[PDB]
């Protein structure tokens, strides 16, 4: 079983690691901490009307359902 | 590509030979054919020389007789045979002319 990496369109930043076998993905596993900010810590050291933009920033495609 | 040899000599110049081959086949033919039978019997370049000399004489006589009766036309006809090295399908127009003024048979 090979151990291939996948660090790539611009479909986000994500680190897939793949236990492989021929052309079969026997086990895929993502590493995800690659874009962290501490949004919860900030909200706390922040407020309500001041923390609304954080929710605006989460899931930045659908930018209003969060608010 | 001249076909005149600065004199009366029609200078075979294979282009001219083909241009007349459209026409030669009906003048020396029977005479001509005897040559081949010689070459069929024994391909000996010695014992088949008389008939070949005869054919060459007949053909040069044809070329002399035919270059004077059609001169201008024939000139341009060979003028369009050296060019287009030997393709009959090209400039058929000249061929047409070479059957109106020139000797048809």
């Amino acid at each position: 079983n090979f151990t291939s990496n996948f660090g790539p369109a611009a479909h986000g930043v994500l680190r897939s690691v793949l236990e492989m076998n021929g052309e079969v993905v026997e086990r895929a596993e993502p590493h995800i901490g690659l874009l962290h900010r501490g949004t919860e810590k900030l909200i706390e050291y922040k407020t309500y009307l001041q923390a609304l933009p954080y929710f605006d920033r989460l899931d930045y495609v659908s930018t209003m359902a969060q608010e | 590509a001249s076909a005149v040899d600065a004199s009366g000599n029609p200078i075979p110049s294979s282009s001219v030979l083909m241009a007349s081959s459209k026409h030669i086949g009906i003048r020396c033919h029977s005479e001509n054919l005897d040559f081949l039978k010689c070459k069929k019997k024994d391909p000996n370049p010695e014992k088949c020389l008389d008939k070949g000399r005869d054919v060459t004489r007949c053909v040069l006589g044809l070329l002399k007789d035919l270059h004077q009766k059609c001169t201008k036309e024939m000139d341009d006809y060979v003028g369009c045979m050296y060019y287009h090295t030997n393709e009959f399908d090209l400039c058929r127009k000249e061929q047409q002319a070479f059957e109106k003024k020139c000797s048809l048979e």
Binding site: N5, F6, G7, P8, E23 | -
Partner: protein
């Protein structure tokens, strides 16, 4: 003695000009398809874009590789380049307007395609990492399968007309274009030419290499690919669409130099390449090779049989 190198230079340089403007026009027309303009700043109409890209890739600070740094890495791109061009040797642009009348031209083109396969496989393996090697193997297998399909198609078009040198073929078409009766054969030949250079719907080898190196080396490689593209287009229009022959045979068309007709047909096929590129998603590798070995081989073989049959029962076969 000296005329021959002059002809060779006159064949080589315009091909490079044309292939640079080919990649330029590729970007432009795909853009127009996608409701946008292409490169339109540098030149008057973007015409100075390929020259600028070339000058950039020239002044760019080079980086020599670290893998068999001579006679095996700095050679294979040159190998595929030489193969593409030496294929370009025997192609008729007009009556007698050729470089060499190699009386078996078709076999020549087929052999040169296989040698291009050699070029790509050795260029892939000459690197260090192994994923490039797996990609090279994949591309080799794809190329060779669609080559056997191209071979059978060539056999069809050859059955339709006795000799092999391409001028004789274009006369046979001068009667009536072989694209008309063998239209499905033309479609299959075009799909096989698409798969042969990995262009429009068959790209997963290259896509994976981009998903997981010299500047001038990569430039030479892309140049070889696009040159082979123009070559495939050229022989497709030289043995399935007429090859410098006016349509409808009316003596107003006969003022066009004939050479113009060949350029118009090959530019149309280039436009079709670029068009079919920007309309379709890509196959996988599994389905790619499956279609190669299941859909085009049997169809091409059946077409050989059928055309031979129809042309052997009636006295239509020269």
């Amino acid at each position: 003695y000296i005329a021959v190198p002059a002809e060779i230079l006159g064949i080589i340089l315009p091909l490079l000009l044309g292939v640079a403007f080919l990649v330029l026009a590729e970007r432009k027309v795909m853009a127009f398809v996608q409701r946008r303009k292409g490169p339109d700043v540098v030149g008057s109409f973007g015409l100075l874009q390929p020259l600028a890209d070339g000058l950039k890739l020239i002044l760019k600070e080079p980086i020599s590789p670290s893998s068999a740094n001579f006679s095996l890495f700095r050679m294979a791109p040159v190998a595929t380049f030489m193969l593409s061009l030496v294929a370009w040797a025997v192609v008729p642009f007009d009556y007698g307007m050729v470089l060499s009348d190699s009386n078996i031209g078709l076999l020549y083109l087929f052999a040169i395609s296989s040698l291009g396969v050699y070029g790509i496989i050795t260029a892939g393996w000459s690197s260090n990492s192994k994923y490039a090697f797996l990609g090279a193997l994949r591309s080799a297998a794809q190329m060779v399968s669609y080559e056997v399909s191209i071979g059978l198609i060539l056999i069809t078009v050859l059955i339709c007309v006795g000799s092999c040198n391409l001028s004789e073929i274009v006369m046979a078409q001068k009667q009536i274009w072989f694209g008309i009766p063998l239209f499905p054969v033309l479609v299959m030949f075009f799909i096989s030419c698409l798969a042969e250079t990995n262009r429009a719907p068959f790209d997963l080898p290259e896509a994976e290499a981009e998903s997981v190196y010299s500047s001038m080396g990569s430039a030479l490689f892309f140049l070889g690919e696009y040159a082979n593209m123009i070559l495939m287009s050229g022989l497709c229009t030289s043995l399935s669409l007429g090859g410098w022959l006016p349509i409808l045979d009316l003596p107003i068309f006969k003022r066009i130099p004939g050479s113009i007709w060949f350029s118009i047909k090959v530019i149309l096929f280039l436009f079709l390449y670029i068009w079919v590129r920007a309309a379709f998603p890509r196959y996988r590798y599994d389905q790619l090779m499956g279609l190669g070995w299941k859909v085009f081989l049997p169809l091409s073989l059946a077409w050989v049989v059928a055309v031979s049959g129809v042309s052997v029962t009636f006295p239509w076969l020269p």
